[PDB]
């Protein structure tokens, strides 16, 4: 015989390891024995918080680990027949730069059926695929969706068709410890959750010059409107409702054209609901009430009466839809910022992660 079982120790890192990613906790496990002592400190001797399972078989760090750190791990395992100790030292990732993600809509919000998930970064993302792999989106009832990038810093996720009311969406951006390309690592994680509200779709038909608001299939409001003139027409397509303003100042000089010129004007506008990054609003237009419902006079915006503008402000929420049809203009760019739904699904599905 002359045989006795000796405790063994195994860990999620190896001694002398470099480039260890902080996207996972570090653990230590005991076999044929139990953990009698476990400690972990950084290069400065500062300890790391951990937790020991009741059976004493598993120890794991409970706080996220830092970059450019050198950690030292000590662990002793005692058993019915022997003991074993190990000291392991490893070096974590050394980023060249960090990037902080920003997600919308906000946590706990109720949004319309056109609202996509948006993850915006504060730096360029050289490895879009890694960014997509690190973003976990849960839908209930489950529905298919896909990623698509609007620029080098913001990516969007949405299903093929408009959301179904009552759908719960949970977004987990787990980019901490992930190399997003060229040494660009995630500064932190993000966790937001939102819900899909009632179906609200408003249709602006250039043939009738009417903006018709439908709530769950029923017409509830019919607004005379004056859209962009033949020289600066309103583009057809689908618009996602964005920010809403009791009032907002629309410049002109911000576009490079001086106000004191033929095609420039400065004005403060009431009851303005943004529906494109390019500057298209549903807003109060006292000056064109006579034209509304007849002819187009704006620069692109959907002019309506003051009372209808305030109504739109009060009855529309972020994510609702505005559809423009039968105008002399082209189609709203798919990567406008609020024109996601104008990209054919097959082109969106395929993505552009390269
Ligand atoms: C309301 C509009 O039609 C414009 N939107 C905007 O943001 O204001 C810019 C502006 C341009 C010229 C004079 C005054 C303000 C259009 C540019 C939106 C297509
Ligand atoms: Cl106007
Ligand atoms: Na050290």
Swiss-Prot record:
Keyword rRNA processing: no
Gene this protein is translated from: ldtB
GO molecular function, one term: metal ion binding
Positions with a binding annotation for substrate: 265, 278-279, 303
Name of the protein: L,D-transpeptidase 2
Induction: Is expressed at a level higher than other LDT paralogs at all phases of growth.
Record-listed Ca(2+) binding positions: 179, 182-183
Pathway involvement of the protein, from the record: Cell wall biogenesis; peptidoglycan biosynthesis
Organism in which the protein naturally occurs: Mycobacterium tuberculosis (strain CDC 1551 / Oshkosh)
Active site positions: 283 (proton donor/acceptor), 301 (nucleophile)
Family matches, as InterPro entries: Big_10 (IPR041280), LD-transpeptidase (IPR050979), LD_TPept_cat_dom (IPR005490), Transpep_catalytic_dom (IPR038063)
CDD domains membership: LDT_IgD_like, LDT_IgD_like_2, YkuD_like
Task performed by this protein: Generates 3->3 cross-links in peptidoglycan, catalyzing the cleavage of the mDap(3)-D-Ala(4) bond of a tetrapeptide donor stem and the formation of a bond between the carbonyl of mDap(3) of the donor stem and the side chain of mDap(3) of the acceptor stem. Is specific for donor substrates containing a stem tetrapeptide since it cannot use pentapeptide stems. Is essential for virulence in a mouse model of acute infection.
Keyword tags: Acyltransferase, Calcium, Cell membrane, Cell shape, Cell wall biogenesis/degradation, Lipoprotein, Membrane, Metal-binding, Palmitate, Peptidoglycan synthesis, Signal, Transferase, Virulence
Listed EC numbers: 2.3.2.-
Location relative to the cell: Cell membrane
Positions bearing the site annotation: Binds to carbapenem drug (covalent): 301
A cellular component annotation (GO) from this entry: plasma membrane
Outcome of gene disruption: Inactivation of this gene leads to altered colony morphology and growth, attenuation of persistence and increased susceptibility to amoxicillin-clavulanate both in vitro and in the mouse model during the chronic phase of infection. Loss of both ldtMt1 and ldtMt2 results in phenotypes that are unique and/or severe compared to the single mutants lacking only ldtMt1 or ldtMt2.
Pfam families assigned to the protein according to its UniProt record, in alphabetical order: Big_10, YkuD
Gene Ontology biological process: cell wall organization; peptidoglycan metabolic process; peptidoglycan-based cell wall biogenesis; peptidoglycan-protein cross-linking; regulation of cell shape
């Amino acid at each position: 015989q002359s045989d006795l079982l000796v405790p063994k120790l195994t860990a999620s890192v190896t001694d002398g390891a470099v480039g260890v990613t902080v996207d996972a906790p570090v653990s230590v496990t005991a076999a044929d024995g139990v953990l009698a002592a476990v400690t972990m400190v950084n290069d400065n001797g500062r300890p790391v918080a951990g937790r020991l399972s009741p059976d004493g078989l598993r120890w794991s760090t409970t706080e996220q680990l830092g970059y450019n750190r050198r950690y030292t791990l000590n662990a002793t395992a005692l058993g019915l027949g022997g003991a074993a100790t190990r000291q392991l030292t490893f070096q974590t990732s050394s980023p060249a730069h960090l990037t902080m993600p920003y997600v919308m809509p906000g946590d706990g919000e109720v949004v319309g059926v056109g609202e996509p998930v948006a993850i915006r970064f504060d730096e360029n993302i050289a490895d879009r695929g890694a960014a997509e792999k690190a973003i976990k989106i849960t839908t209930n009832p489950p529905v298919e969706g896909a990623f698509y990038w609007l620029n080098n810093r913001e990516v969007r996720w949405r299903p093929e068709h408009f959301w179904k009311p009552g759908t719960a969406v949970d977004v987990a951006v787990n980019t901490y410890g992930v190399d997003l390309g060229e040494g660009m690592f995630g500064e932190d994680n993000v966790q937001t959750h939102f819900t899909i509200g009632d179906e609200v779709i408003a249709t602006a038909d250039d043939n009738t010059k009417i903006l018709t608001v439908r709530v769950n299939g029923e017409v509830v409001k019919s607004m005379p409107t004056s859209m962009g003139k033949d020289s600066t027409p309103t583009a057809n397509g689908i618009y996602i409702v964005g920010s809403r303003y009791k009032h907002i100042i629309m410049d002109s000089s911000t576009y490079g054209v001086p106000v004191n010129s033929p095609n420039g004007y400065r004005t403060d506008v009431d009851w303005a609901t943004q529906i494109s990054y390019s500057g298209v609003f549903v807003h109060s237009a006292p000056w064109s009430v006579g034209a509304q419902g007849h002819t187009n006079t704006s620069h692109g915006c959907l002019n309506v009466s003051p009372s209808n503008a305030q109504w739109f402000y009060d009855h529309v929420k972020r994510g609702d839809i505005v559809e423009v049809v039968n105008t002399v203009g082209g189609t709203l760019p798919g990567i406008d910022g609020l024109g996601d739904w104008n990209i054919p699904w097959d082109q969106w599905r395929a993505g552009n992660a390269k």
